[PDB]
Symmetry: C2
Subunit: 384 residues, 2 copies
């Protein structure tokens, strides 16, 4: 029993519709207008072959930039300095307005939605997760605070080894529809989360994608809105974005908050712009000045024991779904496997978006190359 | 063995990627930019409750029109007289730019793509299906001509009883991903089509959705393009449409040509405009003047023995994926279950689009009400 969840549509029964009932009334009225949410679908282009490189000024400072982008399997790259796009790159086959999977950069967007609700006083990070999701009692989420979920400081028996077929990460994917279901798997993401356990210890950073989905669940319970709608209402609809974003959903219509969002590079940059603007977007304030300040300030350094991060960023940390480098530039970034970054460079009031498709999800090699590019581009923006 | 099929992406192996391999290289580069084709996904609106009724002039002639539209579960309704939108209606909850499933109206779009290839001489309707799809040898499609598929004049052991769980129509849905798979089901739509049989007779009309998917298969073999791309290249991209259309795809990426297309009402009207313009669209000629003339002329009346159609349209017929009323106005229409119509009224140079969600897929009751509305609106457009 996972309790009350936002109906797929007004008046919809729990879990309706399913792949086998969407053609039946009363579900069909909603389904006929949102079939992509039920069945895999392709776009039939309204528009009738080569990479687009417009690395503007930074090109002079970084002559081999395009080659470096190709070497890191770059699909879309965009640099926003202030309110101006000063550099752009799109691989052959990927249009400037095409959307790209954000993977874990999605987490930073979810944390933003949580921050908005904290500002409204609908969520108190000091409160235990169970204050909002009682059904998580008896699980590893029984005891920890919402802030500990936000900062990922909960010890959990969860193997985030993507390529490993036995890990909890694969089960998470199967429960959400990212992979084929196996007999006995949890029915949906909510159920999967309730199966998680840990030794009860907290305080130390442990990257776990389940944490973000718990945040999305909390968002749904406090607002009564499907996470998909909450993500739009509290964030996307206030960005004056060029295109809607998309998010994969499981069989109940629950969005894969931890990593299923897709959007254009230019629109993702609008999220960064909002962060550098103290939490304000064209459509209104998204989060408070305080929330943004706390994100830029970083999390507890002592909690950050991930050498995969500290080897490059010794004074790094993590807080509210954002990775904080703690470097001399105060860089903070949303990160997603296979090379996704929503990189903030407050010094130059710039945002760097890099959406890629490395063959591997996470290796020292790829991160070394990628971070080298992000840091070089950031420095190229400094006054000289 | 169903032979060669267009790769999901350049260089992709047969059937790749699958739900279990899209995160792996080299598939991920394509998948990260088209995840909706692999996993059900929802739109995250970039925009921040009541029906919109703008029945313009025809309102005076049809005072109870809005109520009649509500009674027929109308989601979107649009009347294009010449090049001008003279009447519009959208139910509460459905925006003017929202897309709606077309069901079998999709068939008329597929027939249009076939017509384009006939004009190019890449398809000869007189040729047997096996001339283009040899793998269909041994099936009910071994012997009939492409034109017989176009006109649906092939006797097939296929129960098109949607609500019936044992029918071939349900198996068709499961093979394409519209319903949950059962153990033993064909792997994809191509395989399903090869399992179809019949007594060998032809000449009499038999509405069968499998026919359209065979047409789409032929389209792929003659062009080398995924049907999804062919639908864009030969039709959608030439309409100067406001939005892309979408089409559900099966596990191989094959579009559900017989009924999985979704688009806005205004854009669907552009297809009708093209038909009334002799086959020409803003982006170029879609089909020949001759093809359009043949569609408007109708098919063999003797072949049309469907009382569900002839009771209302005694001189009606069917040809090239279009229903021809044979009425005094020469009305022709694309039709899809649950109330979808792309209705052509050549007399007034008008197109009527009605996208609905009747609780039932097909009953005399709903068709009586729906046709009454389409005919009344058509007559309201006559000069007086
Ligand atoms: N389990 C699917 C991948 C989720 C995203 C994880 C990440 O980007 O770190
Ligand atoms: N088997 C799914 C429905 C296909 C559309 C059929 C029709 O609209 O006539
Ligand atoms: Na806040
Ligand atoms: Na033609």
């Amino acid at each position: 029993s996972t309790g009350q969840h936002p109906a797929r549509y007004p008046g919809a029964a729990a879990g309706e519709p399913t792949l086998d009932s969407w053609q039946e009334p009363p579900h069909n009225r909603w389904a006929f207008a949102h079939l992509g949410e039920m069945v895999p679908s392709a776009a039939v282009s309204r528009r009738p072959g080569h990479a687009l490189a417009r690395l503007g000024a930074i090109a002079a400072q970084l002559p081999d930039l395009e080659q470096r982008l190709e070497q890191t399997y770059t699909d879309a790259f965009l640099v926003l300095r202030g309110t101006e796009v000063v550099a752009e790159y799109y691989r052959a086959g990927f249009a400037p307005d095409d959307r790209h999977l954000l993977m874990a950069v999605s987490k930073s967007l979810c944390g933003t939605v949580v921050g908005a609700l904290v500002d409204e006083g609908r969520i108190d990070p000091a409160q235990p997760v169970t204050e909002y999701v009682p059904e998580l009692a008896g699980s590893v989420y029984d005891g920890p605070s919402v802030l500990q979920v936000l900062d990922m400081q909960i010890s959990i028996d969860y193997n985030e080894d993507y390529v490993d077929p036995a890990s909890e990460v694969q089960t998470h994917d199967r429960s959400a529809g990212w992979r084929t279901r196996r007999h006995g798997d949890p029915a949906d993401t909510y159920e999967f989360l309730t199966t998680l356990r840990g030794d009860g210890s907290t305080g130390e950073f442990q990257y776990c994608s389940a944490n973000t989905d718990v945040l999305a669940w909390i968002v749904e319970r406090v607002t009564g809105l499907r996470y998909v709608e909450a993500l739009s209402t509290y964030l996307w609809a206030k960005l004056d974005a060029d295109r809607d974003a998309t998010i994969t959903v499981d069989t109940t219509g629950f969005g894969f908050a931890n990593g299923g969002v897709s959007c254009t590079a230019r629109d993702l940059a609008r999220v960064g712009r909002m962060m550098l603007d103290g939490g304000v977007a064209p459509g209104g304030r998204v989060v408070s000045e305080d929330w943004v300040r706390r994100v830029l300030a970083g999390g507890s350094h002592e909690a950050m024991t991930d050498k995969g991060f500290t080897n490059t960023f010794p004074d790094g940390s993590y807080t509210r779904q954002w990775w904080c480098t703690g470097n001399e530039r105060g860089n903070v970034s949303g990160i997603g496997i296979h090379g996704q970054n929503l990189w903030l460079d407050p010094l130059t009031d710039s945002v760097i978006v890099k959406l890629s498709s490395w063959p591997d999800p996470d290796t020292e090699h790829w991160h070394r190359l990628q971070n080298g590019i992000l840091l070089d581009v950031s420095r190229a923006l400094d006054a000289v």
